[PDB]
Amino acid sequence: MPSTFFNLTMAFSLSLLGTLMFRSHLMSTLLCLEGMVLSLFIMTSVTSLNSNSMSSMPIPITILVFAACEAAVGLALLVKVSNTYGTDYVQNLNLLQC
Amino acid sequence: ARQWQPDIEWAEQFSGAVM
Amino acid sequence: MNPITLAIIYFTIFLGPVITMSSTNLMLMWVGLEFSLLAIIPMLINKKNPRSTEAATKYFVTQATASMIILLAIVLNYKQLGTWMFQQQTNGLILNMTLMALSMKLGLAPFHFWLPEVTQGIPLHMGLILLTWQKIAPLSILIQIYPLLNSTIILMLAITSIFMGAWGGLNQTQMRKIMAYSSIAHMGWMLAILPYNPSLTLLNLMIYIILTAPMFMALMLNNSMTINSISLLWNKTPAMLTMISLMLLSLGGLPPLTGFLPKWIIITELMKNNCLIMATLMAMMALLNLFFYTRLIYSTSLTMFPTNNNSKMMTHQTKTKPNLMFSTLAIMSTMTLPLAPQLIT
Amino acid sequence: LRYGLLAAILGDKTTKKLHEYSRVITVDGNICSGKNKLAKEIAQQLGMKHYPEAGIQYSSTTTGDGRPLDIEFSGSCSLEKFYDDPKSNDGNSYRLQSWLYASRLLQYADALEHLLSTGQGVVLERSIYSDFVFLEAMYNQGYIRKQCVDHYNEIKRLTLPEYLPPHAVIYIDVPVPEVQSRIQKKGDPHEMKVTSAYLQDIENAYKKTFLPKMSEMCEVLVYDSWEAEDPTKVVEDIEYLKYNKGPWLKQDDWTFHYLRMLVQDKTEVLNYTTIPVYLPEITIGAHQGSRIYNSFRELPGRKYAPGYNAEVGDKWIWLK
Amino acid sequence: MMNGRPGHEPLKFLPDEARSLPPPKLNDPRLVYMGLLGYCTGLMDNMLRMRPVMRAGLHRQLLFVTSFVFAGYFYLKRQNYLYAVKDHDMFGYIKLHPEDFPEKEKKTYAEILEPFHPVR
Amino acid sequence: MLKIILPSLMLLPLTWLSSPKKTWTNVTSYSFLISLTSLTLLWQTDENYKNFSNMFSSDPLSTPLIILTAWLLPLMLMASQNHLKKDNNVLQKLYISMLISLQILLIMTFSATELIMFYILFEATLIPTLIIITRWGNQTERLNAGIYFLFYTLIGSIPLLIALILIQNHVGTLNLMILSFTTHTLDASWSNNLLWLACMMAFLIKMPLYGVHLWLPKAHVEAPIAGSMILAAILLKLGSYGMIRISIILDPLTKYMAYPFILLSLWGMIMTSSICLRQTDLKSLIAYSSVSHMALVIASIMIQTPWSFMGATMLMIAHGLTSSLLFCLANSNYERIHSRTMIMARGLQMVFPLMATWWLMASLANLALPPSINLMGELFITMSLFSWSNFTIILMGINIIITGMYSMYMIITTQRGKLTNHMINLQPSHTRELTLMALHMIPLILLTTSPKLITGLTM
Amino acid sequence: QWQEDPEPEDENVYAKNPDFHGYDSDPVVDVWNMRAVFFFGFSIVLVFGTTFVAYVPDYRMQEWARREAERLVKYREVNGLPIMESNYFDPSKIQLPED
Amino acid sequence: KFYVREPVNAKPNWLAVGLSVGASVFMWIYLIQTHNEDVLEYKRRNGLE
Ligand SMILES: CCCCCCCCCCCCO[C@@H]1O[C@H](CO)[C@@H](O[C@H]2O[C@H](CO)[C@@H](O)[C@H](O)[C@H]2O)[C@H](O)[C@H]1O
Ligand SMILES: CCCCCCCCCCCCO[C@@H]1O[C@H](CO)[C@@H](O[C@H]2O[C@H](CO)[C@@H](O)[C@H](O)[C@H]2O)[C@H](O)[C@H]1O
Ligand SMILES: CCCCCCCCCCCCO[C@@H]1O[C@H](CO)[C@@H](O[C@H]2O[C@H](CO)[C@@H](O)[C@H](O)[C@H]2O)[C@H](O)[C@H]1O
Ligand SMILES: CCCCCCCCCCCCO[C@@H]1O[C@H](CO)[C@@H](O[C@H]2O[C@H](CO)[C@@H](O)[C@H](O)[C@H]2O)[C@H](O)[C@H]1O
Ligand SMILES: Nc1nc2c(ncn2[C@H]2C[C@H](O)[C@@H](COP(=O)(O)OP(=O)(O)OP(=O)(O)O)O2)c(=O)[nH]1
Ligand SMILES: [Mg+2]
């Protein structure tokens, strides 16, 4: 448990670092969000199992449900970005500087 | 003389993207 | 949007914060914040142009990232204490990332850079929701854990927001960007006092909201997006010149207007706690806000900018706006300082 | 109940009202081409509403008591002054054209509001879609500056795309030498001063720009004078048009709701005609601007909103 | 600060123990000012709609005045109660902790040697 | 005070519910009657000051300032009528409401018993003042004048707010009477030295102190006449009145803390009076003359002697009437030729003989001709400063010489010499204009007859 | 150039109404504004206000204080006491520090 | 007739007027009654008259 939870927190930190350090594709960033979701799912699930907390096992499922809604909206937005510019590059999304 | 009121040159200093 | 979509989406926009404010479980609070993000995106992008697409995308990636950090804190606390609420024994780093992530959700500086851009890219009535209704859920969470928060991070966020809200608003010719910087400055005041007196955080939130709502309605009346557009008010709707001027001076905190009260009371409470240096710095840089509001008052009601020939055709037309909610909020946001003792306790 | 989302939800819906002749028809052509007589008879024979061509006083006559106003209240522009001196350094040429575009825009919103709310078709005489042929003719004759052209194209870009174009565009083709003869027979002292080069520019703009542009989305019907002189022949062509192209095919109840929300709100319709772009020709200083505005609110029926002017017989003000 | 106190009902606008307090006068200056603000709201609303400021909609003006006074009376009752509770708690706490709030016996100016600072 | 404040508030509905042809006659007449009622505050038959309630009081310092405030409102209305006669009816009523608002705010300011109440009313006055300057000023520089005026005040006022909160947190009250009786000596710490400056700077900027005075010449040159009248007569006196109220709690640090401000004032009064010799703009000249006079008020309050406080009180009232008179006199020529350049109109005694008499008396008042209250205030200030240090008379002596030079210079330049006869639009003086001058000058003479009424708190 | 009014011309106020008092272009309004200022400003405020101030009795107890001083000077002299003593407070009422 | 177009506010909204006067008159009655009972309960609880 001790070493597994350390590695899972590091896995979240890497996924967040991926989110915060953009490259070009918006889709690559949307995948990093799914990575943070995945890390948090396992952390919650393993904690519930390790404490034998059966009343908390609904919570990891609700994490995935709202993550699916977040991911669906992210992809829906990405269709809009691609329609405007023909790519999903984030450097095009700069009209609102002025 | 008449009271001064903003002319085009005065109003154009707010027409830029920034101040 | 057809009526069914409007009802469902607006209901979800309303529901999220209600869930957050009523939830005991931190996971249900996070669920409430999730509803807010998801439901507001289609409204942000409703008009469908490249700027609204940019605004909705920038809003989504910021808000979703902040939501993950909040969830990390909730999960780490669940690991530490086997419970779904933050306690006195919660690890301080867990609480500091909650504060960081919620402040990013609120647009407090230095996590502020997204907010002036998103406000600029969306319709005025959506800017109104973004800067008022959408603040309540993240603030409501913070108010619950106010004894647990670190005063150092709060004051640094608070002074940073007041400084950048001030300097930020000084360079703007776009109204939607001026309101966004006004939001950031006022959030800096709300946050500074939260760890000391959360009731005064709510007092500032209420007065900010009833100032900002009628200010947005006044912009909406003619769709004035710039200083030069609002400077035509004297020719289009001169009856609004009195109330816009007083609302702007009230937002700037000039006595004897209602907007002086939040700055006055927060200073009083900060100095009851020996937070003299921060209170001095906060109050001094808040004067810079009054400067750019005054310049705005100069271009609307105290001088008359040049008008155009087509505006005569506008004077032939009758208007049906504003609704009487404008007058009520406009009066109560400016003329209620005599009733100050009934607002603080 | 004023029209809105509630009224729309309670049955008030556009598609129930549209029938065979719920159409927008515009009649175009050069000056003195016979548009008015034809437009009147098309509307009369088809049971449609005829809108005479929007002029300088169009807004004056559709608000207040409908009586014409003093010119300083109505665009401060003169068609007669335009023909006497189309290069006057007081900006009359472009101030006139800019005012006429905005008056056409107001009329187009009024006609669309009528069609959307009743289902009766409308017949227009030129429109915002064909207003540019006069702007191009002025510029080609050096009557207006290029910056005036850029200002006009900006306002058009901001307003015209919001509306649905006409179902059918009817064009009467009269050559310029015939147009000049009809103007001389018409006997207007100032209009007789119009050059033939100016009339040719109008025709060039009509035939190279407007007609090809309109054929992409509207039924276009071109007639010579001898065909147009019998308006029953034109009507017969209209009765058998198919209308299988353009944006009207993809409208539904809720796109019509939001267009109706735009066109009943006239200050929203006119919003972008007043953008603060400081072209000297159409910029009024505050001293003149405020003197004019103060006098307008002293006209009968104009001091207060309609229904609140006791000096024109409005009653029950204390309960309104 | 007071929210977690003993005998605290959730989302109760006017707890029953508030009925021991004297109610505000209906011509309380704060309630008179509330009604004046409602009157100003009616006039401002007339101005913004280009109506005769004083004459139009006296029914609308009367509702504005009555709503402000009506709401203000009940809100003033709640504010009176919260201030009364604050004093009830403060003094009650003072009595339970007499060692933290001693009576300080003050000295007369016959014994106090204040320094004199000549002005010159 | 409620029997003075409530009728003043009723001037606002009176303005708005009057007919267009009756507004000026109505509001001016009742404004005069309200000035009459304020004289009740002078019925003082004992040495206990009037405390009407927890909120409002009046003592021999606030009573003269309240009455002078009440008197200025009618005078400002008469001053404004001619240059507003082209504004439409609603704009005229809006202007009158701004003038009434200052009258209400200032009367409440001088009668407030609590310092944060003083602060709120003290700050509230900026709103109508700014509106008057910027909406009805004539030149494009009125907007810059508004910015300087608003923000010179505000930057000083924020530290004042902090000090007031700090005092209240420590004492438990900002009531002035209780602060007076319970005051205890301050320790001479760095923290208390910053406290002294926070309590003093806003009042010193408002006077204005030399060095931070640039807002005042800008504000006067650009303001309309009624704005100049209230600004010079009453608004500058908020700083002196504030300093006298709050210095009671600042002892003994004022003994050394005052030195830089005595030095700025005593030297500064020579710099600003000498500017008046080479000023081309008549309004600017009168404005710099005020800065020189208010430098004396600063010095005498700083040394805190019975004579110094009494001389400051008299000078505050005397300067209030005299400077307001000079602005009105200058505005009468400006309304004819629409220039403030002093050297433009000349020999005016030839065509305006009675207005030239008003000019001479205003000038004689300004250079402190005995036995005027102008001289009486300056004399007792000089005596107190000489006691403070005998070398002060050197700077006093220089300022007295220079003050005579520019006072007579203004008269000689504008009233004497050959008439500038191309000015065929020099219409005869209005009855209103000559009445306005008399309403300034009769009280100055009447107060010279009975100078006990403006001696202040110490005598 | 833009569309702006010309500056208005100088006007002689006395040309139409040679009895102008400075208050209003309407002659009847003008004379009544003049009368109200002279009546309320001068006849009422300056005359009666001056009278009322003149008859405020014993202003700041200056008349009582001189009357009280003469009583004390009289008393203190027949009885041989000093006219005025150095100590305002009787030293018996004061307890100095031991040091 | 004056206006070429019929005003929206040509005649009072009689339902709106009646509701407004009803709402205001009801609120004034309820306010006065509630104030009366608030006084009696205060006196009863504090043993006053
Ligand atoms: C906005 C807040 C207030 C309203 C509250 C929400 C309830 C609204 C009730 C009225 C909604 C009915 O709205 C109606 O929705 C249906 C969805 O089946 C749409 O209709 C849809 O299905 C029908 C099938 O025959 C067709 O019209 C079409 O395939 C499609 O548009 C209608 O075009 C719309 O008019
Ligand atoms: C108890 C459950 C509560 C459910 C939640 C209640 C939410 C209440 C808020 C409803 C707000 C509706 O607000 C109204 O919405 C419409 C569309 O919907 C906005 O939008 C409308 O106007 C703008 C003006 O430019 C147009 O750009 C837009 O296309 C048009 O639809 C209006 O500007 C706003 O007035
Ligand atoms: C503490 C004191 C409180 C002070 C209160 C402040 C009062 C409000 C100050 C802002 C003034 C509003 O601004 C003022 O608006 C009015 C209309 O109302 C305008 O009024 C003027 O112009 C408009 C058109 O523009 C005309 O229709 C109007 O008849 C005319 O009088 C003024 O030109 C403008 O300067
Ligand atoms: C600012 C404007 C002020 C306006 C001033 C107007 C003041 C008017 C002055 C009236 C003075 C006379 O006032 C009157 O004098 C008589 C003297 O018989 C005095 O009267 C008193 O003493 C006399 C002495 O014989 C007795 O007889 C009498 O019964 C008793 O009442 C009172 O003082 C008053 O009744
Ligand atoms: N400069 C300018 N003149 C215009 C515009 N629209 C119309 N006019 C002028 C041109 C004509 O001289 C005058 C009369 O309008 P018409 O073109 O319709 O001529 P007429 O009505 O006599 O013939 P008709 O039967 O309608 O076809 O109005 C415009 O957009 N710009
Ligand atoms: Mg025609």
PDB file of all heavy atoms in Angstrom, chain C residues 239-240 324 326-327 332 335 341-342 345, chain E residues 30 33 41 45 47-48 68 75 79 83:
ATOM      1  N   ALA C 239     -30.986  58.735 -20.120  1.00  0.00           N
ATOM      2  CA  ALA C 239     -31.540  58.541 -18.786  1.00  0.00           C
ATOM      3  C   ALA C 239     -30.676  57.634 -17.925  1.00  0.00           C
ATOM      4  O   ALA C 239     -30.771  57.691 -16.698  1.00  0.00           O
ATOM      5  CB  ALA C 239     -32.948  57.959 -18.877  1.00  0.00           C
ATOM      6  N   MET C 240     -29.829  56.810 -18.534  1.00  0.00           N
ATOM      7  CA  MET C 240     -28.977  55.905 -17.783  1.00  0.00           C
ATOM      8  C   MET C 240     -27.706  56.561 -17.260  1.00  0.00           C
ATOM      9  O   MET C 240     -26.975  55.924 -16.502  1.00  0.00           O
ATOM     10  CB  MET C 240     -28.592  54.710 -18.650  1.00  0.00           C
ATOM     11  CG  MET C 240     -28.351  53.455 -17.837  1.00  0.00           C
ATOM     12  SD  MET C 240     -29.808  52.410 -17.785  1.00  0.00           S
ATOM     13  CE  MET C 240     -29.345  51.261 -19.050  1.00  0.00           C
ATOM     14  N   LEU C 324     -37.371  46.307 -14.757  1.00  0.00           N
ATOM     15  CA  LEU C 324     -37.356  47.031 -13.494  1.00  0.00           C
ATOM     16  C   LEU C 324     -36.414  46.411 -12.473  1.00  0.00           C
ATOM     17  O   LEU C 324     -36.259  46.970 -11.385  1.00  0.00           O
ATOM     18  CB  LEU C 324     -38.779  47.134 -12.933  1.00  0.00           C
ATOM     19  CG  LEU C 324     -39.612  45.876 -12.675  1.00  0.00           C
ATOM     20  CD1 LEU C 324     -38.961  44.895 -11.709  1.00  0.00           C
ATOM     21  CD2 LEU C 324     -40.980  46.291 -12.159  1.00  0.00           C
ATOM     22  N   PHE C 326     -33.314  46.350 -13.129  1.00  0.00           N
ATOM     23  CA  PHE C 326     -32.176  47.251 -13.229  1.00  0.00           C
ATOM     24  C   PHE C 326     -32.282  48.366 -12.199  1.00  0.00           C
ATOM     25  O   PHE C 326     -31.324  48.647 -11.474  1.00  0.00           O
ATOM     26  CB  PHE C 326     -32.072  47.834 -14.640  1.00  0.00           C
ATOM     27  CG  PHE C 326     -30.989  48.861 -14.779  1.00  0.00           C
ATOM     28  CD1 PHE C 326     -29.703  48.487 -15.112  1.00  0.00           C
ATOM     29  CD2 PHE C 326     -31.252  50.202 -14.557  1.00  0.00           C
ATOM     30  CE1 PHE C 326     -28.707  49.432 -15.227  1.00  0.00           C
ATOM     31  CE2 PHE C 326     -30.259  51.140 -14.662  1.00  0.00           C
ATOM     32  CZ  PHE C 326     -28.984  50.755 -15.001  1.00  0.00           C
ATOM     33  N   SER C 327     -33.450  48.996 -12.107  1.00  0.00           N
ATOM     34  CA  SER C 327     -33.616  50.125 -11.197  1.00  0.00           C
ATOM     35  C   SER C 327     -33.456  49.698  -9.748  1.00  0.00           C
ATOM     36  O   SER C 327     -32.853  50.415  -8.946  1.00  0.00           O
ATOM     37  CB  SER C 327     -34.981  50.763 -11.416  1.00  0.00           C
ATOM     38  OG  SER C 327     -35.135  51.119 -12.769  1.00  0.00           O
ATOM     39  N   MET C 332     -30.103  49.973  -4.945  1.00  0.00           N
ATOM     40  CA  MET C 332     -29.602  49.307  -3.748  1.00  0.00           C
ATOM     41  C   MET C 332     -28.095  49.133  -3.771  1.00  0.00           C
ATOM     42  O   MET C 332     -27.497  48.930  -2.714  1.00  0.00           O
ATOM     43  CB  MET C 332     -30.267  47.941  -3.568  1.00  0.00           C
ATOM     44  CG  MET C 332     -31.776  47.974  -3.351  1.00  0.00           C
ATOM     45  SD  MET C 332     -32.380  49.354  -2.365  1.00  0.00           S
ATOM     46  CE  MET C 332     -32.501  48.581  -0.771  1.00  0.00           C
ATOM     47  N   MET C 335     -27.123  53.446  -2.853  1.00  0.00           N
ATOM     48  CA  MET C 335     -27.751  54.343  -1.884  1.00  0.00           C
ATOM     49  C   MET C 335     -28.096  53.661  -0.564  1.00  0.00           C
ATOM     50  O   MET C 335     -28.987  54.120   0.147  1.00  0.00           O
ATOM     51  CB  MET C 335     -29.016  54.958  -2.477  1.00  0.00           C
ATOM     52  CG  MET C 335     -28.814  55.612  -3.829  1.00  0.00           C
ATOM     53  SD  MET C 335     -30.221  56.568  -4.439  1.00  0.00           S
ATOM     54  CE  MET C 335     -30.610  57.634  -3.052  1.00  0.00           C
ATOM     55  N   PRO C 341     -25.267  48.976   9.187  1.00  0.00           N
ATOM     56  CA  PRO C 341     -25.289  48.032  10.318  1.00  0.00           C
ATOM     57  C   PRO C 341     -26.144  46.798  10.081  1.00  0.00           C
ATOM     58  O   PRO C 341     -25.885  45.762  10.700  1.00  0.00           O
ATOM     59  CB  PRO C 341     -25.843  48.875  11.472  1.00  0.00           C
ATOM     60  CG  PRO C 341     -25.616  50.267  11.078  1.00  0.00           C
ATOM     61  CD  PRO C 341     -25.709  50.317   9.598  1.00  0.00           C
ATOM     62  N   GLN C 342     -27.139  46.867   9.209  1.00  0.00           N
ATOM     63  CA  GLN C 342     -27.996  45.728   8.919  1.00  0.00           C
ATOM     64  C   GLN C 342     -27.390  44.778   7.896  1.00  0.00           C
ATOM     65  O   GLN C 342     -27.991  43.741   7.609  1.00  0.00           O
ATOM     66  CB  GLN C 342     -29.358  46.219   8.425  1.00  0.00           C
ATOM     67  CG  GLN C 342     -30.241  46.830   9.514  1.00  0.00           C
ATOM     68  CD  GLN C 342     -29.741  48.172  10.032  1.00  0.00           C
ATOM     69  OE1 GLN C 342     -29.655  48.390  11.238  1.00  0.00           O
ATOM     70  NE2 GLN C 342     -29.403  49.071   9.121  1.00  0.00           N
ATOM     71  N   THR C 345     -23.820  42.562  10.271  1.00  0.00           N
ATOM     72  CA  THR C 345     -24.241  41.631  11.306  1.00  0.00           C
ATOM     73  C   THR C 345     -25.753  41.690  11.430  1.00  0.00           C
ATOM     74  O   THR C 345     -26.420  42.316  10.609  1.00  0.00           O
ATOM     75  CB  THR C 345     -23.595  41.946  12.663  1.00  0.00           C
ATOM     76  OG1 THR C 345     -22.189  41.677  12.608  1.00  0.00           O
ATOM     77  CG2 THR C 345     -24.237  41.112  13.776  1.00  0.00           C
TER      78      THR C 345
ATOM     79  N   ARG E  30     -34.971  53.717   9.798  1.00  0.00           N
ATOM     80  CA  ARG E  30     -34.434  52.802   8.800  1.00  0.00           C
ATOM     81  C   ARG E  30     -35.527  52.268   7.881  1.00  0.00           C
ATOM     82  O   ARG E  30     -35.273  52.047   6.695  1.00  0.00           O
ATOM     83  CB  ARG E  30     -33.696  51.652   9.487  1.00  0.00           C
ATOM     84  CG  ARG E  30     -32.476  52.100  10.273  1.00  0.00           C
ATOM     85  CD  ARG E  30     -32.054  51.083  11.298  1.00  0.00           C
ATOM     86  NE  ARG E  30     -33.070  50.891  12.320  1.00  0.00           N
ATOM     87  CZ  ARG E  30     -32.879  50.252  13.465  1.00  0.00           C
ATOM     88  NH1 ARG E  30     -31.698  49.734  13.761  1.00  0.00           N
ATOM     89  NH2 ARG E  30     -33.879  50.134  14.317  1.00  0.00           N
ATOM     90  N   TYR E  33     -36.495  55.156   5.541  1.00  0.00           N
ATOM     91  CA  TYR E  33     -35.509  55.273   4.475  1.00  0.00           C
ATOM     92  C   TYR E  33     -35.670  54.166   3.440  1.00  0.00           C
ATOM     93  O   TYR E  33     -35.445  54.391   2.247  1.00  0.00           O
ATOM     94  CB  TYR E  33     -34.100  55.252   5.058  1.00  0.00           C
ATOM     95  CG  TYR E  33     -33.029  55.501   4.034  1.00  0.00           C
ATOM     96  CD1 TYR E  33     -32.963  56.699   3.345  1.00  0.00           C
ATOM     97  CD2 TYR E  33     -32.098  54.529   3.737  1.00  0.00           C
ATOM     98  CE1 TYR E  33     -31.995  56.917   2.405  1.00  0.00           C
ATOM     99  CE2 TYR E  33     -31.130  54.738   2.806  1.00  0.00           C
ATOM    100  CZ  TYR E  33     -31.073  55.927   2.140  1.00  0.00           C
ATOM    101  OH  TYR E  33     -30.095  56.131   1.205  1.00  0.00           O
ATOM    102  N   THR E  41     -36.640  54.085  -6.547  1.00  0.00           N
ATOM    103  CA  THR E  41     -36.599  53.022  -7.542  1.00  0.00           C
ATOM    104  C   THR E  41     -37.728  53.168  -8.547  1.00  0.00           C
ATOM    105  O   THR E  41     -37.534  52.952  -9.746  1.00  0.00           O
ATOM    106  CB  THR E  41     -36.675  51.664  -6.849  1.00  0.00           C
ATOM    107  OG1 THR E  41     -35.678  51.605  -5.826  1.00  0.00           O
ATOM    108  CG2 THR E  41     -36.448  50.541  -7.831  1.00  0.00           C
ATOM    109  N   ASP E  45     -37.085  54.009 -12.439  1.00  0.00           N
ATOM    110  CA  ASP E  45     -37.655  53.113 -13.435  1.00  0.00           C
ATOM    111  C   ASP E  45     -38.465  53.879 -14.470  1.00  0.00           C
ATOM    112  O   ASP E  45     -38.394  53.577 -15.664  1.00  0.00           O
ATOM    113  CB  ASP E  45     -38.519  52.060 -12.752  1.00  0.00           C
ATOM    114  CG  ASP E  45     -38.950  50.964 -13.696  1.00  0.00           C
ATOM    115  OD1 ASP E  45     -38.077  50.371 -14.362  1.00  0.00           O
ATOM    116  OD2 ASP E  45     -40.160  50.689 -13.781  1.00  0.00           O
ATOM    117  N   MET E  47     -37.919  57.013 -15.352  1.00  0.00           N
ATOM    118  CA  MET E  47     -36.962  57.742 -16.176  1.00  0.00           C
ATOM    119  C   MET E  47     -36.350  56.838 -17.232  1.00  0.00           C
ATOM    120  O   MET E  47     -36.230  57.218 -18.400  1.00  0.00           O
ATOM    121  CB  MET E  47     -35.855  58.336 -15.311  1.00  0.00           C
ATOM    122  CG  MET E  47     -36.234  59.563 -14.531  1.00  0.00           C
ATOM    123  SD  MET E  47     -34.937  60.115 -13.395  1.00  0.00           S
ATOM    124  CE  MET E  47     -33.444  59.832 -14.350  1.00  0.00           C
ATOM    125  N   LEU E  48     -35.948  55.635 -16.832  1.00  0.00           N
ATOM    126  CA  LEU E  48     -35.268  54.738 -17.749  1.00  0.00           C
ATOM    127  C   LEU E  48     -36.180  54.262 -18.871  1.00  0.00           C
ATOM    128  O   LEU E  48     -35.683  53.871 -19.927  1.00  0.00           O
ATOM    129  CB  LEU E  48     -34.704  53.546 -16.978  1.00  0.00           C
ATOM    130  CG  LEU E  48     -33.620  53.872 -15.940  1.00  0.00           C
ATOM    131  CD1 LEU E  48     -33.368  52.667 -15.069  1.00  0.00           C
ATOM    132  CD2 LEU E  48     -32.339  54.342 -16.578  1.00  0.00           C
ATOM    133  N   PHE E  68     -40.466  47.550  -0.388  1.00  0.00           N
ATOM    134  CA  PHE E  68     -39.258  47.897   0.348  1.00  0.00           C
ATOM    135  C   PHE E  68     -39.527  47.966   1.845  1.00  0.00           C
ATOM    136  O   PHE E  68     -38.739  47.458   2.647  1.00  0.00           O
ATOM    137  CB  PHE E  68     -38.702  49.226  -0.153  1.00  0.00           C
ATOM    138  CG  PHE E  68     -37.861  49.105  -1.380  1.00  0.00           C
ATOM    139  CD1 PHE E  68     -38.355  48.494  -2.518  1.00  0.00           C
ATOM    140  CD2 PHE E  68     -36.574  49.607  -1.403  1.00  0.00           C
ATOM    141  CE1 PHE E  68     -37.591  48.387  -3.644  1.00  0.00           C
ATOM    142  CE2 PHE E  68     -35.807  49.499  -2.529  1.00  0.00           C
ATOM    143  CZ  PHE E  68     -36.314  48.885  -3.650  1.00  0.00           C
ATOM    144  N   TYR E  75     -36.631  41.976   7.674  1.00  0.00           N
ATOM    145  CA  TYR E  75     -35.177  41.912   7.721  1.00  0.00           C
ATOM    146  C   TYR E  75     -34.634  42.660   8.935  1.00  0.00           C
ATOM    147  O   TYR E  75     -33.678  42.206   9.568  1.00  0.00           O
ATOM    148  CB  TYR E  75     -34.594  42.466   6.422  1.00  0.00           C
ATOM    149  CG  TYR E  75     -33.129  42.175   6.238  1.00  0.00           C
ATOM    150  CD1 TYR E  75     -32.698  40.912   5.877  1.00  0.00           C
ATOM    151  CD2 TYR E  75     -32.180  43.161   6.425  1.00  0.00           C
ATOM    152  CE1 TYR E  75     -31.363  40.642   5.710  1.00  0.00           C
ATOM    153  CE2 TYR E  75     -30.850  42.905   6.262  1.00  0.00           C
ATOM    154  CZ  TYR E  75     -30.441  41.647   5.904  1.00  0.00           C
ATOM    155  OH  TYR E  75     -29.107  41.386   5.740  1.00  0.00           O
ATOM    156  N   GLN E  79     -32.246  41.295  11.916  1.00  0.00           N
ATOM    157  CA  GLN E  79     -30.998  41.947  12.295  1.00  0.00           C
ATOM    158  C   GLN E  79     -31.006  42.350  13.760  1.00  0.00           C
ATOM    159  O   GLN E  79     -29.978  42.247  14.433  1.00  0.00           O
ATOM    160  CB  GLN E  79     -30.738  43.165  11.404  1.00  0.00           C
ATOM    161  CG  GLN E  79     -30.510  42.860   9.924  1.00  0.00           C
ATOM    162  CD  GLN E  79     -29.762  41.569   9.678  1.00  0.00           C
ATOM    163  OE1 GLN E  79     -30.266  40.657   9.032  1.00  0.00           O
ATOM    164  NE2 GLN E  79     -28.555  41.484  10.204  1.00  0.00           N
ATOM    165  N   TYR E  83     -28.138  40.806  16.608  1.00  0.00           N
ATOM    166  CA  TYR E  83     -27.371  41.659  17.505  1.00  0.00           C
ATOM    167  C   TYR E  83     -27.680  41.350  18.963  1.00  0.00           C
ATOM    168  O   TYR E  83     -26.789  41.402  19.814  1.00  0.00           O
ATOM    169  CB  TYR E  83     -27.655  43.129  17.206  1.00  0.00           C
ATOM    170  CG  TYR E  83     -26.830  43.705  16.098  1.00  0.00           C
ATOM    171  CD1 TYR E  83     -27.390  43.950  14.856  1.00  0.00           C
ATOM    172  CD2 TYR E  83     -25.495  44.023  16.287  1.00  0.00           C
ATOM    173  CE1 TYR E  83     -26.653  44.477  13.839  1.00  0.00           C
ATOM    174  CE2 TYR E  83     -24.746  44.556  15.269  1.00  0.00           C
ATOM    175  CZ  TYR E  83     -25.334  44.787  14.047  1.00  0.00           C
ATOM    176  OH  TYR E  83     -24.605  45.317  13.018  1.00  0.00           O
TER     177      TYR E  83
END
